[PDB]
Amino acid sequence: CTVDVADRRKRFWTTQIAACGTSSDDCGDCARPGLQLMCNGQGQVTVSTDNYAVGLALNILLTDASKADTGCGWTPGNRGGFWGDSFRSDNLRSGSKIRQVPTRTSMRETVSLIRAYALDDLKKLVTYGVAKSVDVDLTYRGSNKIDMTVIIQGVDGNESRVGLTGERISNAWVWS
Amino acid sequence: CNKQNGVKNILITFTDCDTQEVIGPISHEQPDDTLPTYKNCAWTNTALTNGYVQRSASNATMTLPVVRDLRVPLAFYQGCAQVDVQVEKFDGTVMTLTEGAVVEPEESDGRSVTMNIVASEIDELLPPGSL
Amino acid sequence: DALSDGFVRLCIDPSLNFFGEGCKILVEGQMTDDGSATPDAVTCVTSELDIIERFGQGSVLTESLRKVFCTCKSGVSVYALPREDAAAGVKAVYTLTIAGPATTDGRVQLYMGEAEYAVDIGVDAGDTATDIAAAIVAAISPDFPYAATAAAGVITLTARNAGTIGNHLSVIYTNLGSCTSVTPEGVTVTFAQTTAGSVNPTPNDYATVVNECCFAVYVLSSDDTDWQENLRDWIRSAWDCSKPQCFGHGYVFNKGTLGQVLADGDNSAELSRLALPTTYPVLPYLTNAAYGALSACSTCNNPELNIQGQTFGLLSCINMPESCTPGWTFGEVTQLQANGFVVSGPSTTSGQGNYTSPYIYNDVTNYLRDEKNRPNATFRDASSRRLAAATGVALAEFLQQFNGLAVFTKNTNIRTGIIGTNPRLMLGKIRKWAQDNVGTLFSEFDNINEDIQLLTDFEVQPKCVGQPGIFHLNMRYRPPVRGARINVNMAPALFDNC
Amino acid sequence: DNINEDIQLLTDFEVQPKCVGQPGIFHLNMRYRPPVRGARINVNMAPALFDNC
Amino acid sequence: TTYPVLPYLTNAAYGALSACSTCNNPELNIQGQTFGLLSCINMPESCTPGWTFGEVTQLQANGFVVSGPSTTSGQGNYTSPYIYNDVTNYLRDEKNRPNATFRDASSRRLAA
Q1: Which of A79, C118, C162, C218 could form a disulfide with A74 if both were Cys (CB 3.0 to 4.6 A apart)?
Q2: Strand-pair partners of B9
Q3: Closest Cβ–Cβ partner in C211, C243, C244 for E47
Q4: Residue C454's closest CA among C428, C484, C478?
Q5: Is residue E85 within 8 Å of E65, Cβ to Cβ?
């Protein structure tokens, strides 16, 4: 009984930044995310399950969404997306489309376009009920360099504040 | 001296719109004897009846007749760039204005421009000693 | 990747924590010998899973760090400064005597330190005191800052860190001498405090350890007033006019009776004393570190936020059972408010027992007099200090556009085409920047005509001593004011007349 | 990048040495760059458990 | 004495910068966070910054160029150095008198 206060809900494997190490290519150092294997005292490895929200954000940013219908067409196998979206019930798509920007001159317009796309795609974190106020701060024009820091606002696993305007996220058990 | 109604210094700082490159503050000079004119009060009154007033909202306005610099494109003086203006008269007053917006462009032969700039508020410096 | 399709190529930053790295908090305290950290050297702490192996199990610092992590999970990067125990330190030893034998079953509950170290065991009838003590010692939390042993029903708690930080546990909350619905009938306890505190580390080497490595919030987990005075001297040196500043603020505590607390304070404008009564349940450095971490990680980009009140100044990681007397009596509370002392009190009115959570009133610094002994209130509020720092950085960042700009004094007649300026124009621009930040950095003003002065070096130094290009910007401001002092004059009127 | 010093049109009378140029000949120097495509965004993802509105 | 970067590297970087940014504009000093930034030199971060401020001002006084970091970011990554006081080693005049006519290098390029 009284023990109750701890959800029996668990978390599955989570993709993590720099799980497979950096990859230098003389332009900089990338992250190459993947799955982190946590070892034990006596063999018995196990996949890690931390940073759930960042895991969803990586799953969203780093997967191509469906392309838009053009008169040119697409190769049967290049039109992006996931067939598993045919079975979900929330009536949404899976992935992002930052890599589908219609490039143009005057890189300020390209920056604004990428901002719009990244924000529209990351809003699915709030729509799923995992964060509350995800937001981006994409600001640069350089030659082509761009910085795109992302903030994923979260909660705790026990409602400690009374009288909020919104409504507790539906999945505040991941701790966001 | 301090007894001469006239403009002494005009500094204009241009900010390109699509590159955010700051240019200036370049000095500037008048094309003729007409001086720049100002208006600071944001709310503008209007008469109503026996003694009362109806109050409207407006901008801090400035009219600046200036001679185009041959190093700056003409379009910078006609609403295609953000401007920061600073005018110092001979009696000591200094009017600064930042984040302006040239609001009403008009045809100019290529030398003399008349910029109509609107901002949120204009700052006034008032020679030492003031009530 | 070559296999990719489009052209926009994202390059994820190697790791997260970007939005921090600007709110560094240095937690200072002692560590045990189990730890693998090099003493007397600042070293950051990323996560909570590796403080026990780095700073030893159950040490003083290993729990300050735990409270700093519990308080706010992200937003800051914490740096631990471990300090080795003193050479001639004698660990403080407490004795806890248990007398049986029990006659009816029940539960034995004890509250040592805070709620995280609480213990709760089951006791059958006919059990002897030796078995009760053995069970207690077998269920005592291993992170408790006291190695616990048992012998013939007598429990000995030996402080894991040698020094006077072992003398701050004197109020244990048992469940054995009452009528609670679970009570081994025939079991009593006794608190002893056999040995006593000792000599404390007095390092005084902050210059060498951290010199130009600017921090935001220093937390001290010790009560030796000389160590607090060394920390105050460091933070005061950091706000100097000689070297470029690394603004900061420090958090210490001072536990004892009213006179002792009023005696430990001074005009140290850089610290924030936390007055704690003699019978405080929580180990003092725990609540000190909770307050320090909350202050450090809520006021990163909001430097005007005052940390005081039941919402913004709540210490959620602290859970105390209430007491008969309210610790500080109201008279003593006001006495402490007056002499720049922070006071913490319980939020809910829950009655005896009945866990609660302390919060902070008057988030103020220990600054009550000025230079030349003239009383003030400029640096009393702890937000006024953060706003002084922010005003400095913002003004100095704004003034950068005049670097290398041609300056025309003695003629103030910049020609047509030059990109120069003169002191009147610089003063105009600065005055506009100032009256532009009214409401975010400054109060309204009092007289902006003579509050802000821009003089040229050629008219301050004596004749033929000034240098060309040097300037002098003298500003006088007031941080944004808050609240009012309205005076009501309520008066009825039975007669009427309209 | 800077169209003022990217396009130059000089006359042959001022390129060759004196009394060597011919009338009518010009010299057009242009320095260009083909249209650029794509970007090099640097994501800096970081969560935030605390909240201070 | 504890400089991490090989000396001639930063010396040549400073020399090239001062030659590719001033030869068409012989008035601006190689100085400050924007102009005097040696982007090709990368040092590891550190909190003890070589010259203490006392030594720094002592060197500024005796006509020496001093260099510091540009981020002092504790322990996260490399940072580019940065020069102060783009000056020359001209303390006192030819007779013996002290004067600053040839103190900063832009005065030299301007005289030329």
Answers
A1: A79
A2: B88
A3: C211
A4: C428
A5: yes
- Asked whether at least 3 C-beta pairs link C and A within 8 Å, the reply is yes
User: What residues in A contact B19, CB-CB < 8 Å?
Assistant: 141
Secondary structure of residue A108 in the 3-state scheme: helix
CA-based nearest residue to C321, from C278, C362, C276, C352: C352
CA distance A108 to chain B (A): 7
Interface partners of chain E (CB pairs < 8 Å, 3 or more) are: C
Search chain A and give the residue with CA nearest D41.
Answer: A146
Bridge partners, residue A153, by sequence:
D48
C214/E49 Cβ within 8 A? no
Q: Print the SS3 string covering chain C.
A: CCCCCCCCCCCCCCCCCCCCCCCCEEEEEECCCCCCCCCCCCEEECCCCCCCCCCCCCCCHHHHHHHHHHHCCCCCCEEEEEECCCCCCCCCEEEEEEECCCCCCEEEEEECCCHHHCEEEEECCCCCHHHHHHHHHHHCCCCCCEEEEEECCEEEEEECCCCHHHCCCCCCECCCCCCCCCCCCCCEEEECCCCCCCCCCCCCCHHHHCCCCCCCEEEECCCCHHHHHHHHHHHHHHCCCCCCCCCCCEECCEECCHHHHHHHCCCCCCEECEEECCCCCCCHHHHHHHHHHHHHHHCCCCCCCCCCCCCCCECCCCCEEECCCCCCCHHHHHHHHHCCCEEEEECCCCCCEEEECEEEECCECCCCECCCCCECCCCCEHHHHHHHHHHHHHHHHHHHHHCCCCECCCCCCCCCCCCCECHHHHHHHHHHHHHHCECCCECCCCCHHHHCEEEEHHHCCCCCCCCCCCEEEECCCCCCCCCCCCCCCCCCCCCCCC
Question: Residue E95: how many CB atoms within 10 A of its CB?
Answer: 6
Count of other CB atoms within 10 angstroms of residue C194: 9
Query: Please, are residues A176 and A131 in contact by the beta-carbon 8 Å criterion?
Result: yes
Q: B109: which residues sit within 8 A by CB, 6+ positions away?
A: none
CB contact under 8 A, A114 and C8: yes
The CA distance from C250 to E23, in Å, is 50
Which one, of C457, E27, E25, C408, lies nearest residue B11 by Cα? C408
Residue bearing tokens 């009816």: C104
Q: Would you call C15 and A100 a contact, using CB atoms and an 8 Å cutoff?
A: no
Range C367-373, long-range pairs (CB < 8 A, 24+ positions): C367/C267, C367/C268, C367/C269, C367/C340, C368/C267, C368/C339, C368/C340, C369/C267
- Closest-CA distance, B39 to chain C, in angstroms, reads 17
Task: Give all chains having 3 or more CB-to-CB distances under 8 Å with chain A.
Answer: B, C, D
Decide: B97 and B86 in contact? Cβ < 8 Å: yes
C217: closest CA among C397, C325, C75? C75
State the DSSP H helix or E strand holding residue A154, giving kind and residue range, or none if neither: none
Please tell me which residue of chain D has the smallest CA distance to C295: D52
SS (H, E, C) E18-32: CCCCCCCCCCCCCCH
Structure resolution, Å: 3.2
Tokens of D8: 């130059």
Beta-strand relationship, C106-110 and A145-148: unpaired
> How many C/E residue pairs have CB atoms within 8 Å?
32
**Dihedral sign for Cα atoms in the order C5, C10, C11, C12:** negative
How big is the B-C interface in CB pairs under 8 Å? Answer: 57
- Give residues with Cβ within 8 angstroms of C152, minimum separation 6: C129, C130, C133
B88 near C CB under 8 A: yes
For residue D37, the chain A residue with the least C-alpha distance is A103
Experimental method: cryo-EM
The residue whose two tokens read 């003389």 is A26
**CB neighbours (10 Å) of residue C265?**
18
